[PDB]
């Protein structure tokens, strides 16, 4: 199915606050380190959003120039689309329909089904036109729309890298519309690229800030016990010893119920099966 | 956009000054409900749809919830529980022509009442009965620049202040007050507040960090909203004698 | 009964519109409105 | 209604009296005499 492991990419500053060279835990939405992600180049079908996503690219290409989201993905419920045209970006609440192939040397806006009944535009400056990589994630909370990004170098043509980076907000958007699925933004050229998608969960993380205030790297504490302890002692240096960390309950299975033997009585139907009235 | 050419046109994701309008006195018949005028310049929402039409100076005195001059009985009607404002003034300066501006016809009288927010937009030739007199009693305005007092084609606007479950209360800023240093103050930034002396701040932020805390969640480093510069906080001299 | 008289009053004020008063016909229209609602 | 409609339509005939047009003023007053007859 063209799976691949999600090694260490996938953090994002959980909030617009600063701290100075401290440890700091937090519960929010992330992806599990060493989890699976899918990719492709023939064609990329729709994927369901489902509570926060995380996206990446290949190198030596730009054919993919955005994303589109929603729930019913038609003119019924307001939708959205994100692309740029090399000098000024566009963001819509516009009602374009998911074609058999919503896509675009250039076939501009060939995705366009119908520009009808659109309520909010947005124009601004760009993020990106053996090259960089695309490190973006999206989430919808408190009736909001979010964004987190960065622009980082990349090599090793084959597949994802190792190493670890921070992420950055672009700008928050008070759209509020509903989304439950989405679809890549690809095109046909009349080519071989890599999109990457993984889901999110509510796991609690342990974040270390450098001298200046940049997130060097953190550690999730559900992977294995070694990690777990590290978040119940508040450091990266477990001194020799022993620590109980947490507990566990082996749950039940089926919740049987028992009650008296026969439990069938009280002549009721012969009154309705009666003769006359 | 005249009174049978109403357009619920859109205003959102934008902060519009409203109090500069009062001291401007560009309108002349300020009256509204649902909010104190001097308070709307402080709180408001999305859904700022408006209208701008032409009205004979007479009927204005009744533009209201439930009450409305029966001229706009069809042309434009309002309900109660209307959270917004309705302001108006004169337009007989240019919006009037010799011989009368018949360019606009105003609707007259229907077999049935109208309820607010919905109208009847198509040509009306009054029917004396099932069929009309089988001619036209439909009427159009006339506005000579020398018209009377109660018949100045007035200038009129209606404002909408409601909120769906969407975001974006897009309302007036706080004019901005000049900061102070080297004196303990009950400072209050954009929602954040506390006390203390603001002073220099060597600590070097990054371009996306509103404010700062060090450990135990003590608030100690704020980027000023004005110039992105960085400010320090310190609960100042206190204790026990 | 019907609005025949009303229609003729409209015709009167419109002939005055064709005359060139651009105020009198307006008054007449206002009062026609008043009778229709009355 | 009769008093008010009559008062107002007589005001109309008075106005169109002031603005010279005898035939239309007299026609509106003939409808008022119709109110007298109807
Ligand atoms: C990830 O995918 C590989 C194959 O691509 C599979 O062997 C493994 O069980 C998967 N694990 C998870 C957690 O998805
Ligand atoms: C536009 O979409 C909105 C959805 O809120 C709907 O209420 C409205 O009737 C639509 N109008 C047109 C002209 O499509
Ligand atoms: C749509 O939005 C409403 C609230 O805005 C929410 O209750 C609902 O779960 C969302 N999704 C669908 C599929 O309706
Ligand atoms: C911290 O910031 C200073 C000045 O901005 C810079 O010189 C230094 O390189 C930064 N720290 C690291 C580890 O890069
Ligand atoms: C009632 O209990 C007896 C006990 O042996 C059992 O044999 C019988 O099947 C029970 N009846 C029902 C209806 O369960
Ligand atoms: C009447 O008797 C039939 C069987 O002859 C039974 O299936 C039905 O349940 C009885 N009527 C009612 C109302 O239960």
Numbering used by the authors:
A (entry chain C): 26 to 66, 79 to 141, 153 to 177, 186 to 246, 261 to 347
B (entry chain A): 348 to 481, 489 to 595
C (entry chain D), D (entry chain E): 1 to 38
Q: What's the paper's own text on this?
A:
Here, we demonstrate a strategy for designing dimeric helix-hairpin motifs from a previously reported three-helix-bundle miniprotein that targets the receptor-binding domain (RBD) of severe acute respiratory syndrome-coronavirus-2 (SARS-CoV-2). The dimeric four-helix bundle competes with the human angiotensin-converting enzyme 2 (ACE2) in binding to RBD with 2:2 stoichiometry. The interaction between the receptor-binding domain (RBD) of severe acute respiratory syndrome-coronavirus-2 (SARS-CoV-2) and the human angiotensin-converting enzyme 2 (ACE2) served as a fertile ground for testing our hypothesis.
To investigate the structure of dimeric SIH-5 bound to RBD and its consequence on the spike protein, we resorted to electron microscopy at physiological pH where 68% of the spike protein are present in an 1-RBD up conformation. To identify the interacting residues between SIH-5 and spike protein, we improved the resolution of the single spike protein trimer bound to SIH-5, which was solved at a resolution range of 3.5–4.5 Å using a local resolution calculation and a global resolution of 4.47 Å at 0.143 Fourier shell correlation. The total interacting surface area of SIH-5 with RBD is 944 Å2.
